[PDB]
TrEMBL record, chains A, B, C, D, E, F, G, H:
Entry annotated with the keyword Hydrolase: yes
Lineage of producing organism: Bacteria, Pseudomonadati, Pseudomonadota, Alphaproteobacteria, Hyphomicrobiales
Biological processes per GO annotation: nucleobase-containing compound metabolic process
Binding site for GMP 3: 78, 102, 117, 200
GO MF: 3'-5' exonuclease activity; metal ion binding; nucleic acid binding
Protein name, UniProt field: 3'-5' exonuclease
Annotated binding of Mg(2+) 2, by residue: 24, 83
Coiled coil: none
Length: 201, 201, 201, 201, 201, 201, 201, 201
């Protein structure tokens, strides 16, 4: 497993002239206003990953932000509701072309109530996915391998979920959900993170 | 209060050459697959209302459906999530240009947890809004007046909510919510009515 | 309101050569093994009622039991699940031709969650229904009038519910529910009173 | 273990000239209106099973439906409330001569609160019973063996439960429950799937 | 209503040469270790009451304590579990001949779940019973009348409850409950106030 | 381990001329009115046990009942609240000299919330205690050994608990609890099994 | 009632050369990061009040901030946990000499669970205290009178609570609570608003 | 591991001329008014521990109390809220210079909800931490080693937590929390142990 670790930003976009990029983050916690972004991981789907350590107070990451802003490149997340929020809060750019494996699982794997990444990878790919101070100056090898494992499989999952969405004729539902997901993340940032805006009560 | 009661459909659209129409429904209950649409009420905002009794098994309402399908006319609902679902289930057309006073209340009246129509009308307009077999062949006068009261005030509420959304700079949030609302209703019809599709669990 | 009060049993069946009889009970509480039957009230639907005081330890009531056993006479209850249980526990005969207004309400009044007798009488008939030691040797006038009020309206409710069941095409569902209701009461007597026998868990 | 896999329907009824047949299903989920029937498994009790893959949109299965409709053949289920609902929804025929091992367990194994098939098979027979896309065009061997395991033991369980029902004198209770079970399934299909129709509230 | 207000103790026992005395207390709250006893009220059942203000730090009340210790005089409480605890904590003597109207209500008024003193007095006697700093140096007239109202009716209630306990043949159950009640209060003082000592868990 | 299995009753009391006997039961479930007594196990504390199979409908067991009635012999239970109830319901005699290890645990092992027999035996004695049709005509060896294991250790536990009750000065509390326990069991039989008779609500 | 309404800030501090000032706020909601401060009300305790409308985006209020920063002047709040948070978030200064009537009520009115301002004013002073867009450009007379009513009584309450704290010897407890309250508010601002920092879990 | 076991008190303070001491206790339970202090364990951080058995009724421990009272020595606890309460209740001295690893964890390990000592030691130090009658006259070796394990690591944890508090700029928050913690313990002793004194309700 080749994992390239960077400080601050990608050196260039030579490895990311592609149609879709897998994205994940690590933070100090679940609350973007308190808990800073510490790591961003990326994969092109070729079995390699980039792990970018984000410094305290860092406001810019131009190569990463070009990827996040490029409307011709789909950003793949698992539970992108969180990653979109923390990315937009940190760098000021909200991606608007996204695919979320958690929404896709809820729209296709209707025979189960377990939609976590480990269960999805286990069922769909027979891949076994295995408290950490992500703000440490030097990440451990175990940390780097764990961080990389979260992006290595998202392309294959997206392909399978696209097949299932076509099979059950739910493609337009998923498309509308993905179109709204960035605004759901914005609603989280604005103060409605605990509110289902569509519920009767 | 002039309330025009119709059987099946509007006679024509002479009163609805307008930019926005207030819409509400009455049904036999909260479950569109079991509980049929019984009444549709409309208002142009001029203080009059149309009350249309829908027959059992009725599949078409061409004048009403032209209004529901006309993209140049905004359909105003209170909690349109339900009305859109029952309308689409009954006539096969899902409106796609909508405004919902419940979403607007949740985005602007942040100082309260009561977002029902009675409280909104009381606070914003000083208007007092006051178990019924809506499938009865002949509706009572009390039924007709109650049914009309649900559409008589939606234009004024929409105007006030638009002022507040501009004041708090939440117009684009509301616009995205309204754009997604028809798909939220479709999700309800397809079997996800009890599921928040965006929740982590 | 003519209310005839009896000790032990009806004097004869001269007033009950009819197709359906309204039945209700009063007890010392909700648990038939602890809380004895104290009063049985009956009505033919003609606006009069019979109120029969049941003695402690009384094992037989032949005229009443003939009515309860007569398969040609429908016994009308509101929430007959309880009355059937206490009657069978007290006199050893379980009626098997019954109509229950609570089951009928749950099958027809789908637009509300309030299925109590007061709400049903209020909505369907515009009739206002208004801690009591029912084992007292002499019942008060208020007790007698309250006891009679529970049977005076069941015939009219049954007629309306039959119309609604026909309208919504749920007659065979109701018939099967009424056929099972005596066994639901037996299940209560045998020790499953707190168990939904059909639930997955 | 001989397991015969069929497409669409049984080829004939040569193996099912018997008094009782074990039946189970697999689906895309718990909601019959959204989640289609994918597999039906059958056993005569001789240690072999038939596994029938049901196609999307399939409306007819004449040999299977003859079995389901034959009043001289008892259909054995575990939690037949679900299987009856999905079968009736798919093929339009509701079986009316049934035996359910879950109801039988709740009526006889009163010393435990675990009524699942694994626990019943473990206790009564010392047999160890061990997220799956059941709509796959080709089922895996593990899927076929799991699907067969759900019907291989129902005859032996029915025999034991009949002995216990006789011992505790609960045969007529069980008979009435089995007679009502198809209507409980119909109630589920009609929209009362979340409602205990016999509860006070 | 003659209400005699005393400081510290009764002047003598001339009014309490009787077989049963009604007793109640007022405190600064529900926790005897934190919230001191402020008032003790007594009645002989003759329609008069004694209201004794207890000083901060007061350790002795000899006339009162003689009454509390006299085994020939039954102490009547409503929910004596609390009063016994606070009395024993304050003066070091636990009464051991008691009658509690709350236990009696739970053993006889099985047709209701409301066992408060107001409901009992309303049902059994047609008597209407109507945040207060009970440690105030001078009690208000409203305070004195309220304090007296809690003891004026306990004799009549005890008489009625004794009749009902005889009628339902529960006298020995009640006697055993009253015998254990002082130890239940001791258990409260020792630290088990939140624990049902007889529960399985 | 010598375990003597008997039908109906002990042959004689030659092994039970002792000051305390360990007692346990097995039944068809937790509800004495529905679930019959199937087995009674006894031990003198000498490392042997007697296992008595009780027949359906058996009304008498004279040697056992002499033991249960002998006021000079303490009956030791773990959670005697249940065993006393089922014994009194079956044979008509309620023991009145008892010791309960569950009450004792709750009064002494205040540093834990786990008061089950396995945990008590593990902590106090370093003894490892390891769905069963107890009404079977022939009990299995595993059943007999399990049934015996529930009485083999109660004498040693009683001795230790008596030491702890003396150490923490809670002997009189325990004595009062044991004196009330038979009436708690009677309250269960009379219909208050789900009610804490001493609670405020 | 003289109520002086100001825009932005007090004109001067001529009325506030005093030892204690009553303070309250109004906002657009309970979440300081989303819901802006709209009104600040002040009283010297002389029966008059100042009502200061705060503009959107206003960052400074020098006279008000001098009062908030003056360590020689005690700021009286009811539930100051919120007001301190919103004031510090808006103007950047956290008061550090405070008195809170809610903490005082919880430390002294131990005989009740209702600690709201209405109940406190009703009990202690016999004063009757009687959804509002507080961001409106012009406040209504009803709004102004309601806003003033929240500060008119805090001095009298503080005096009474100081008497009670002295009486029950809880002065040092209250002093430590008031000393920590500003840091509790800071914890709210930093992201622990939903966390009891002292709880075990 | 050198563990020195003492009766009553330390023999002298020769090993505790240090700036910080790790402290833990063992008791008979969670309620200081009922459950006595049984053991106090101390460590200087040098890998050795002192285990002091406290006798029933012991009121004084002069060397220990000098340590607890010495304002120049920081007392380190894990969840000191409890230990401070039981120590103050037993010896009458409340320490006022403290550090709590549970508060520190809640202020720094924001990426997890598990703040127990085992998880903290596992994550921060890679140290594996592994129902007991602590009032026994002779403690077992397993008891002594377990008791010592609770203090052996608190110095190292305090050092790491101080680094993290500096990194996230939360030092003054923690300092204020530690300053209030002794009064939180006093509030527990006075009767508010179940009350969050800062909550709105």
């Amino acid at each position: 497993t080749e994992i390239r670790v960077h400080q601050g930003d990608l050196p260039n976009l030579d490895n990311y002239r592609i149609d879709a990029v897998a994205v994940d983050t690590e933070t100090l916690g679940l609350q973007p206003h308190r808990d800073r972004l510490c790591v961003v991981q990326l994969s092109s789907g070729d079995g390699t990953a980039d792990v970018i350590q984000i410094a305290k107070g860092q406001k810019s990451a131009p190569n990463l932000v070009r990827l996040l802003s490029d409307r011709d490149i789909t950003k793949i997340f698992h539970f992108g509701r969180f990653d979109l929020a923390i990315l937009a809060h940190t760098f000021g750019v909200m991606p608007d072309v996204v695919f979320c494996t958690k929404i896709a699982s809820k729209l296709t794997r209707t025979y189960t109530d377990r939609h976590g990444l480990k269960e999805i990878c286990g069922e769909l790919l027979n891949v076994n996915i295995s408290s950490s101070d992500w703000a440490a100056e030097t990440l451990s090898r175990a940390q780097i391998e764990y961080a990389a494992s979260d992006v290595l499989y998202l392309h294959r999952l997206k392909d399978i979920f696209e097949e299932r969405l076509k099979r059950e004729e739910r493609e337009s539902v998923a498309k509308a959900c993905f179109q709204f997901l960035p605004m759901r993340a914005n609603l989280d940032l604005l103060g409605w993170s605990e509110i289902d805006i569509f519920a009767h009560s």
